[PDB]
Amino acid sequence: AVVKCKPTSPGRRHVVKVVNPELHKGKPFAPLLEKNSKSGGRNNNGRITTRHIGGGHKQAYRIVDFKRNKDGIPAVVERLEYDPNRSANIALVLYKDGERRYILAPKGLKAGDQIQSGVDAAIKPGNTLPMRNIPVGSTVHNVEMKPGKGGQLARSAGTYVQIVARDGAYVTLRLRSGEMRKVEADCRATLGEVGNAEHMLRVLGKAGAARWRGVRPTVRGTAMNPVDHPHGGGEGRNFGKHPVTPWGVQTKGKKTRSNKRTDKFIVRRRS
Amino acid sequence: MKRTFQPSVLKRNRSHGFRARMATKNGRQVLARRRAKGRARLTVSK
Amino acid sequence: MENNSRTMPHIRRTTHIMKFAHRNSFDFHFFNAR
RNA sequence: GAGGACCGAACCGACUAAUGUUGAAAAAUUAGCGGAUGACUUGUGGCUGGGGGUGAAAGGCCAAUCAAACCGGGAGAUAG
RNA sequence: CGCCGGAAGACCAAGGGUUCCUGUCCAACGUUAAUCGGGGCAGGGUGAGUCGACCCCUAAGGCGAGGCCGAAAGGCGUAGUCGAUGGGAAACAGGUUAAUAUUCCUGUACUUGGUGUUACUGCGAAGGGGGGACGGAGAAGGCUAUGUUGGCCGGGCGACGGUUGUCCCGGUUUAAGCGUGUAGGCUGGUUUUCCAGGCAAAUCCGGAAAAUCAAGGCUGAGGCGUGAUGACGAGGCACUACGGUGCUGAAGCAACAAAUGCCCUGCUUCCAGGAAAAGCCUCUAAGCAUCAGGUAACAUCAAAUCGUACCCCAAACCGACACAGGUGGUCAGGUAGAGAAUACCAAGGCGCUUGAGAGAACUCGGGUGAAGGAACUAGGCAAAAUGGUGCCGUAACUUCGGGAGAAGGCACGCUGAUAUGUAGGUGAGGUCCCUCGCGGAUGGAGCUGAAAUCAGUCGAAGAUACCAGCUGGCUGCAACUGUUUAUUAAAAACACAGCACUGUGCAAACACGAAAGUGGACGUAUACGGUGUGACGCCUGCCCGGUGCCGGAAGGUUAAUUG
RNA sequence: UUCCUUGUCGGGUAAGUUCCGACCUGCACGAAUGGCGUAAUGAUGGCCAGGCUGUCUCCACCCGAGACUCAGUGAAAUUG
RNA sequence: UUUAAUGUUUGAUGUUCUAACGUUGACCCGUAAUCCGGGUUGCGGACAGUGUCUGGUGGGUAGUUUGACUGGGGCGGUCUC
RNA sequence: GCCCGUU
RNA sequence: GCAUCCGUAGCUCAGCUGGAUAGAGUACUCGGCUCGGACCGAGCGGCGGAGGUUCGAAUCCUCCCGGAUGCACCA
Ligand SMILES: NCCC[C@H](N)C(=O)O
Ligand SMILES: [K+]
Ligand SMILES: [K+]
Ligand SMILES: [K+]
Ligand SMILES: [K+]
Ligand SMILES: [K+]
Ligand SMILES: [K+]
Ligand SMILES: [K+]
Ligand SMILES: [K+]
Ligand SMILES: [K+]
Ligand SMILES: [K+]
Ligand SMILES: [K+]
Ligand SMILES: [K+]
Ligand SMILES: [K+]
Ligand SMILES: [K+]
Ligand SMILES: [K+]
Ligand SMILES: [K+]
Ligand SMILES: [K+]
Ligand SMILES: [K+]
Ligand SMILES: [K+]
Ligand SMILES: [K+]
Ligand SMILES: [K+]
Ligand SMILES: [K+]
Ligand SMILES: [K+]
Ligand SMILES: [K+]
Ligand SMILES: [K+]
Ligand SMILES: [K+]
Ligand SMILES: [K+]
Ligand SMILES: [K+]
Ligand SMILES: [K+]
Ligand SMILES: [K+]
Ligand SMILES: [K+]
Ligand SMILES: [K+]
Ligand SMILES: [Mg+2]
Ligand SMILES: [Mg+2]
Ligand SMILES: [Mg+2]
Ligand SMILES: [Mg+2]
Ligand SMILES: [Mg+2]
Ligand SMILES: [Mg+2]
Ligand SMILES: [Mg+2]
Ligand SMILES: [Mg+2]
Ligand SMILES: [Mg+2]
Ligand SMILES: [Mg+2]
Ligand SMILES: [Mg+2]
Ligand SMILES: [Mg+2]
Ligand SMILES: [Mg+2]
Ligand SMILES: [Mg+2]
Ligand SMILES: [Mg+2]
Ligand SMILES: [Mg+2]
Ligand SMILES: [Mg+2]
Ligand SMILES: [Mg+2]
Ligand SMILES: [Mg+2]
Ligand SMILES: [Mg+2]
Ligand SMILES: [Mg+2]
Ligand SMILES: [Mg+2]
Ligand SMILES: [Mg+2]
Ligand SMILES: [Mg+2]
Ligand SMILES: [Mg+2]
Ligand SMILES: [Mg+2]
Ligand SMILES: [Mg+2]
Ligand SMILES: [Mg+2]
Ligand SMILES: [Mg+2]
Ligand SMILES: [Mg+2]
Ligand SMILES: [Mg+2]
Ligand SMILES: [Mg+2]
Ligand SMILES: [Mg+2]
Ligand SMILES: [Mg+2]
Ligand SMILES: [Mg+2]
Ligand SMILES: [Mg+2]
Ligand SMILES: [Mg+2]
Ligand SMILES: [Mg+2]
Ligand SMILES: [Mg+2]
Ligand SMILES: [Mg+2]
Ligand SMILES: [Mg+2]
Numbered sequence A: 001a002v003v004k005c006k007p008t009s010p011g012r013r014h015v016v017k018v019v020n021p022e023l024h025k026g027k028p029f030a031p032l033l034e035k036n037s038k039s040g041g042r043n044n045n046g047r048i049t050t051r052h053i054g055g056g057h058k059q060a061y062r063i064v065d066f067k068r069n070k071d072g073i074p075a076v077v078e079r080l081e082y083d084p085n086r087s088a089n090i091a092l093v094l095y096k097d098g099e100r101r102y103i104l105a106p107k108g109l110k111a112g113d114q115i116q117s118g119v120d121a122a123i124k125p126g127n128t129l130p131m132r133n134i135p136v137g138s139t140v141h142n143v144e145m146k147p148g149k150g151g152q153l154a155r156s157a158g159t160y161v162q163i164v165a166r167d168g169a170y171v172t173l174r175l176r177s178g179e180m181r182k183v184e185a186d187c188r189a190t191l192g193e194v195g196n197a198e199h200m201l202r203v204l205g206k207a208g209a210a211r212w213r214g215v216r217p218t219v220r221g222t223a224m225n226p227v228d229h230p231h232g233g234g235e236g237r238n239f240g241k242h243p244v245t246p247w248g249v250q251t252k253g254k255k256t257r258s259n260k261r262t263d264k265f266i267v268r269r270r271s
Numbered sequence B: 001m002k003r004t005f006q007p008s009v010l011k012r013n014r015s016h017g018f019r020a021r022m023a024t025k026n027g028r029q030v031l032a033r034r035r036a037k038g039r040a041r042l043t044v045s046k
Numbered sequence C: 001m002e003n004n005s006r007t008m009p010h011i012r013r014t015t016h017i018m019k020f021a022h023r024n025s026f027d028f029h030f031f032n033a034r
Numbered sequence D: 001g002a003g004g005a006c007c008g009a010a011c012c013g014a015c016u017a018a019u020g021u022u023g024a025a026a027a028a029u030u031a032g033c034g035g036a037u038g039a040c041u042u043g044u045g046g047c048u049g050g051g052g053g054u055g056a057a058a059g060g061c062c063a064a065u066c067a068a069a070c071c072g073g074g075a076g077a078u079a080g
Numbered sequence E: 001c002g003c004c005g006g007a008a009g010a011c012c013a014a015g016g017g018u019u020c021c022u023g024u025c026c027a028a029c030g031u032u033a034a035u036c037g038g039g040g041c042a043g044g045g046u047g048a049g050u051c052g053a054c055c056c057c058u059a060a061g062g063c064g065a066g067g068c069c070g071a072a073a074g075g076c077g078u079a080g081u082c083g084a085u086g087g088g089a090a091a092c093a094g095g096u097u098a099a100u101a102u103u104c105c106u107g108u109a110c111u112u113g114g115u116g117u118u119a120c121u122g123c124g125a126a127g128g129g130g131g132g133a134c135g136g137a138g139a140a141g142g143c144u145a146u147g148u149u150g151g152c153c154g155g156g157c158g159a160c161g162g163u164u165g166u167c168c169c170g171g172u173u174u175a176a177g178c179g180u181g182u183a184g185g186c187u188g189g190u191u192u193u194c195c196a197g198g199c200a201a202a203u204c205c206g207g208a209a210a211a212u213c214a215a216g217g218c219u220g221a222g223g224c225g226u227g228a229u230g231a232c233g234a235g236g237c238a239c240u241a242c243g244g245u246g247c248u249g250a251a252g253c254a255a256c257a258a259a260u261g262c263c264c265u266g267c268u269u270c271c272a273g274g275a276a277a278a279g280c281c282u283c284u285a286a287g288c289a290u291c292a293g294g295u296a297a298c299a300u301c302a303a304a305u306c307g308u309a310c311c312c313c314a315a316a317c318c319g320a321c322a323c324a325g326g327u328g329g330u331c332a333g334g335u336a337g338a339g340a341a342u343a344c345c346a347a348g349g350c351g352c353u354u355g356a357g358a359g360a361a362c363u364c365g366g367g368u369g370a371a372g373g374a375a376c377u378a379g380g381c382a383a384a385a386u387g388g389u390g391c392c393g394u395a396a397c398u399u400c401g402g403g404a405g406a407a408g409g410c411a412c413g414c415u416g417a418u419a420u421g422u423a424g425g426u427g428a429g430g431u432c433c434c435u436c437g438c439g440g441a442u443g444g445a446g447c448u449g450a451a452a453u454c455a456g457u458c459g460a461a462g463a464u465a466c467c468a469g470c471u472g473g474c475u476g477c478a479a480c481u482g483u484u485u486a487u488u489a490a491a492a493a494c495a496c497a498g499c500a501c502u503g504u505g506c507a508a509a510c511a512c513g514a515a516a517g518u519g520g521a522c523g524u525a526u527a528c529g530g531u532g533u534g535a536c537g538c539c540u541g542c543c544c545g546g547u548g549c550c551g552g553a554a555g556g557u558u559a560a561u562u563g
Numbered sequence F: 001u002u003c004c005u006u007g008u009c010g011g012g013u014a015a016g017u018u019c020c021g022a023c024c025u026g027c028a029c030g031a032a033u034g035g036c037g038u039a040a041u042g043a044u045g046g047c048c049a050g051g052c053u054g055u056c057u058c059c060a061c062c063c064g065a066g067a068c069u070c071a072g073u074g075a076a077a078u079u080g
Numbered sequence G: 001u002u003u004a005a006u007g008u009u010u011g012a013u014g015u016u017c018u019a020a021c022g023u024u025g026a027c028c029c030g031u032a033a034u035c036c037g038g039g040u041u042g043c044g045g046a047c048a049g050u051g052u053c054u055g056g057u058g059g060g061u062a063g064u065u066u067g068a069c070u071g072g073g074g075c076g077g078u079c080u081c
Numbered sequence H: 001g002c003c004c005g006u007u
Numbered sequence I: 001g002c003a004u005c006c007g008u009a010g011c012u013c014a015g016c017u018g019g020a021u022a023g024a025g026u027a028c029u030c031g032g033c034u035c036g037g038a039c040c041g042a043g044c045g046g047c048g049g050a051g052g053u054u055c056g057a058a059u060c061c062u063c064c065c066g067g068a069u070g071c072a073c074c075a
């Protein structure tokens, strides 16, 4: 449910928030929490290597199961929880032996639903099976690229992957970008879409809301001096050159993919 | 107003003290130079 | 920098005293022969 | 009982005027002024090192020094 | 006599290092003199099982055996080991020195270990689980610190009219610990059986099932009792080197008001979703098994070492100075007040290390001003003016929130009555009930106490001082709150939410690195980077010749190589 | 953003190179190095009005700190 | 000039293969260890990647150049016969 | 295929 | 004020054949189709001025006039 705020102040006029009342109002499950301290976009040399990262709210890391290899044992969904580390919501499940795990919460999944992993599970949203046992045409998410490695594709809120063909030991996937990719058929996938599909409907409204997420302000290169950026300089507003990065590489159109060992898996690039 | 020297004994010894000099090769050459000049205080210490 | 002054050992940069363009009350309207 | 909400001390800042300009002070004082639950402010410790850092970008700041810091050396550079 | 009193008082951290106290000296130092001093010289002064460090445990981060990488020097990093600004056992009141005191003395306490004796007993970890253990905002209730008034006790009867009273001044203080368990907060309890989980095991945690009980447990300020037949105590008496010293000592209660402190690491609510590890509790493995070990009582022993003076919004720290500067934390009295604003005061601390005269111009900081009222000037610069609470009233425009405190106006002191003090707040006695106590009902003494109306009355003036918005009309730019040239520029510049293009399929693009590796990200196209534009509303037209980028492969030209 | 230019007309003033409204002859506006609007906001730029005033006509007097005299201490820039 | 036949051959493209090489897939051990190494297996596979040589691109970065006369420099003009 | 007008 | 490029038929523009010869569209005139357009067939209509070289100039020189473009900076 998206709600518009009322314009009681100029920083509240444009705020549109996504409020989900079925989330757990309470503390998260403590044995699956870890420390996660912030970086500032700096590496082990101490240098800024990614700009515009800094500050934000303190966050604890939730150990989410991306593998889903606890085969054969059923699990009941206890509740849905907020995760500050990702765009999607997470679900706390309880297996029959008494193990608790966090999974990504799919679309339409409530508290009390029954999920099951493994090779002989049923085709319903929330179950994780290898893709040689999934019908062609299904909508899946949390897709593995290597068998046993863990899910890596279609993890963000509202995303999914369609299974277009199965030919031999490989399946062809239509990725969310529009790219056709071959992945081998022994890799796992979870049925359904990722939940929280109106995450892209929210409006931050004010500059401080971006600072709460650890995003620092972007300075335009044309607003600098020539010593700082290629776009810098001018007596007034001058541009005069082709648009480039801060390191002089042409942006706005120039391709940067250079990976000769993975090109055989890509059937069609995005358009 | 606030001037540039704000003293702190822990930050003094961690930055320019004796074990800080002895840790690197370049800091051990600072000590060799000062011993060769014959200086009465090698490092900034207690 | 003036590092071994014997008459004024306390100060190293003294050009804010006698140079007219570096004093705090220098005004650029004094430089009107342009 | 929400808010980069309102008035206003602490706290943080520096728009105007006068004084001062061998000053009480190598940038302040007095009288007004702005923010004042936030993109706030502050203590202690830590990390980034010179064609490099850091920069809500003024060539700003990096120990009263910055269109390339300081110290030592090449070095008695060269100077129609 | 004057000044400060949310400090210009008091206590510390940081930093300094003898500046502390006593005697002595006045050359130099002190912006003057100096008998004085943070100056010279000499002597003295810092007492801890409980305060702090050290110690045990970790954060960011550092170093890092092996290892990986690099002409050399070195770089990164595993196991580890360090690293507080965070977590971890325990003491209070009074007295005392010229100078130290939660350290000494008096009184009364507490904690953790070692050893020994007795009684009983499954003890054991580098492993498992629990706990420690955590955000912002808001609201209310119960309390205390503290204050005020009464009562009580001691003293007083007033330099000038009055002052035996509804009069004046002073005092009315008491801790940790131990005992009791209240306002409040959280949670169902117990037994039995079983199980793909917790790297193996487990009686512990997690899960399942069944039976049974209507209660149980955990947490917790304050109060009360004890500590305390003590200590302190206004004063009085006795000596004195007139600085001080010795002895004795009355009352020591109640009501009301009340925190930003405590209950509260709570409760409610929101999204931006809020450290770690040990001490602590518990489970077992290898193992040992009349051992060792564990639990309780008692006795005994130990608790080392280092810091402790003094200054600390400053004449002792950072500023060359005894320099209108800068500097983190804690304590928070009275009257008026919404208040930590402001005015005057208390405790306490000071009068700022040149003075004495005179009363010219001119300069600085202020006060007042006939008649006029922006005529001044680049420009109302600067001054002057407005200023509080309650109530009435308030336009265009608008994104429906605003505009708005729009504009403008009226009331405001004191005394009496309503009402010997009202509405409201607090609530003793008495009585009743039980659960017999820190309980409930009734009851209203005493205390506290607005706001309004009516009548009267004084002044030129009642928000009387300090304190405390000038208002309105038209228009450019930028949506807005923010940010910036430390020291001549705060803005129309930068940023911003929003929009678009483009790159990127994860060993991602990209960035820092000769490399290893790291950031991006423990993220995965509703994500991440780059570029331009800059809320919102209505929109964003035509040109691909030039330069760039993307796609194409026929033909032409074309490197090393071959010869 | 307009050189010519204080363009021309209208409003405001006794009198207006600025301001506000319009005209179009745009030296040399123009659509995301955005176009045109826009409530609220601004120590932002321009203009007008009321109130208020030593800003001024045009200054006068008073209260303090210096300046002046006495005692003590005792500089500086500059200089054939 | 023109073609086919036999014998012999290298280059091109294509298809599989595994054994070099890759693995920031899984499991086991050194081992109390998300490093590293070894082992087992899976997936890639003579590709990728790296060294030497070579063509292109390359203000990302560096070193420099950018004349003189002149009724001041610049602009214009001039520079030899 | 095109093929206006008429004070 | 300096520099550069242009003045050709009523109008808008080519021609520099490196000096020996002036064209195109439109306009206009005549005839036809039907009253007028449109349409069809024919035609007419001249190198900015003033000198100089030259056997000879629209063309090449020198000056003048007119029209455009650019520049006029540091104080
Ligand atoms: N870094 C500060 C040094 C100050 C020195 N006395 C000077 O005059 O520069
Ligand atoms: K920007
Ligand atoms: K600029
Ligand atoms: K509020
Ligand atoms: K901080
Ligand atoms: K440098
Ligand atoms: K320095
Ligand atoms: K003397
Ligand atoms: K002095
Ligand atoms: K600490
Ligand atoms: K735990
Ligand atoms: K259990
Ligand atoms: K344990
Ligand atoms: K002490
Ligand atoms: K005099
Ligand atoms: K006000
Ligand atoms: K706009
Ligand atoms: K400003
Ligand atoms: K700026
Ligand atoms: K994007
Ligand atoms: K990470
Ligand atoms: K084009
Ligand atoms: K093009
Ligand atoms: K094209
Ligand atoms: K213009
Ligand atoms: K008129
Ligand atoms: K007029
Ligand atoms: K402003
Ligand atoms: K304005
Ligand atoms: K392999
Ligand atoms: K290759
Ligand atoms: K000349
Ligand atoms: K001349
Ligand atoms: Mg960015
Ligand atoms: Mg942006
Ligand atoms: Mg700039
Ligand atoms: Mg550049
Ligand atoms: Mg421009
Ligand atoms: Mg000095
Ligand atoms: Mg605010
Ligand atoms: Mg600033
Ligand atoms: Mg100021
Ligand atoms: Mg001020
Ligand atoms: Mg303020
Ligand atoms: Mg204001
Ligand atoms: Mg305010
Ligand atoms: Mg904030
Ligand atoms: Mg710090
Ligand atoms: Mg500039
Ligand atoms: Mg210096
Ligand atoms: Mg500096
Ligand atoms: Mg340089
Ligand atoms: Mg040399
Ligand atoms: Mg020399
Ligand atoms: Mg006073
Ligand atoms: Mg001394
Ligand atoms: Mg003393
Ligand atoms: Mg003296
Ligand atoms: Mg003294
Ligand atoms: Mg002394
Ligand atoms: Mg001495
Ligand atoms: Mg300790
Ligand atoms: Mg290391
Ligand atoms: Mg070497
Ligand atoms: Mg340690
Ligand atoms: Mg003392
Ligand atoms: Mg544990
Ligand atoms: Mg109390
Ligand atoms: Mg008596
Ligand atoms: Mg009496
Ligand atoms: Mg009398
Ligand atoms: Mg640990
Ligand atoms: Mg000091
Ligand atoms: Mg000082």
Ligand SMILES: [Mg+2]
Binding pocket: none
């Ligand atoms: Mg100094």
Ligand SMILES: [Mg+2]
Binding pocket: E322
């Ligand atoms: Mg003094």
Ligand SMILES: [Mg+2]
Binding pocket: none
């Ligand atoms: Mg001072």
Ligand SMILES: [Mg+2]
Binding pocket: none
């Ligand atoms: Mg302060």
Ligand SMILES: [Mg+2]
Binding pocket: none
């Ligand atoms: Mg005050």
Ligand SMILES: [Mg+2]
Binding pocket: E348
């Ligand atoms: Mg006092």
Ligand SMILES: [Mg+2]
Binding pocket: none
């Ligand atoms: Mg006077």
Ligand SMILES: [Mg+2]
Binding pocket: E369
């Ligand atoms: Mg007057």
Ligand SMILES: [Mg+2]
Binding pocket: none
């Ligand atoms: Mg009068």
Ligand SMILES: [Mg+2]
Binding pocket: none
């Ligand atoms: Mg008057």
Ligand SMILES: [Mg+2]
Binding pocket: none
């Ligand atoms: Mg005027």
Ligand SMILES: [Mg+2]
Binding pocket: none
């Ligand atoms: Mg005038």
Ligand SMILES: [Mg+2]
Binding pocket: none
């Ligand atoms: Mg003013």
Ligand SMILES: [Mg+2]
Binding pocket: E395
């Ligand atoms: Mg109106």
Ligand SMILES: [Mg+2]
Binding pocket: E402
């Ligand atoms: Mg309103």
Ligand SMILES: [Mg+2]
Binding pocket: none
């Ligand atoms: Mg309204």
